[PDB]
Design a protein around this ligand. Structure first.
Ligand SMILES: Cn1nc(C(=O)NC[C@@H]2Cc3ccccc3CN2)c2ccccc21
Ligand SMILES: [Zn+2]
Length: 140
């Protein structure tokens, strides 16, 4: 679990969005596992605007933050998991490291702020849904 709180937006994994999320929807993409809903409260997170490929991600299944190198956002085959069919997620970044399902929503961060959220994993890789191209998270 986990979310990004920027301005009056809440960014979550689309597969973990609540009814309150869907009832207050701004934007959703199955192609990215991202959903953004509206909040009453102002959030304190800053979105990175950059092309960093090093950062740190939170791994709930180890109660640890890990430093990683990651690929630039791309179109990636997510091999079938026990609970999710094979599908192609887009705007996806991969790193070598530990992940399990309940780590989806963990933040990846660089020197510039929040880069993305854990979205995929398997065979010793962890996949992050990028948010750095969503410039509108910064305004309105
Ligand atoms: C961190 N992590 N995440 C997942 C995961 O399945 N997330 C669901 C999410 C939504 C979804 C829906 C349809 C098709 C594919 C997908 C893929 N991404 C996972 C599985 C094994 C190990 C680690 C993992
Ligand atoms: Zn950066």
């Amino acid at each position: 679990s986990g979310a990004i709180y920027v301005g009056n937006y809440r960014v979550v994994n689309r597969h973990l969005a609540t009814h309150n999320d869907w009832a207050n929807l701004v934007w959703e993409d199955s192609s990215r596992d991202l959903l953004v809903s509206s909040t009453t409260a102002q959030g304190c997170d800053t979105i990175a605007r950059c092309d960093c490929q090093t950062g740190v991600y939170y791994c709930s299944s180890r109660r640890k933050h890990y430093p990683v190198s990651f690929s630039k956002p791309s179109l990636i085959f997510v091999e079938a998991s026990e609970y999710y069919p094979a599908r192609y997620q887009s705007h996806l970044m991969l790193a070598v490291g530990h992940s399990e399902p309940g780590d989806c929503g963990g933040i990846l961060r660089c020197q510039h702020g929040v880069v993305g959220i854990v979205s995929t994993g398997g065979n010793g890789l962890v996949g992050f849904a990028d948010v750095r191209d969503l410039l509108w998270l910064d305004e309105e």
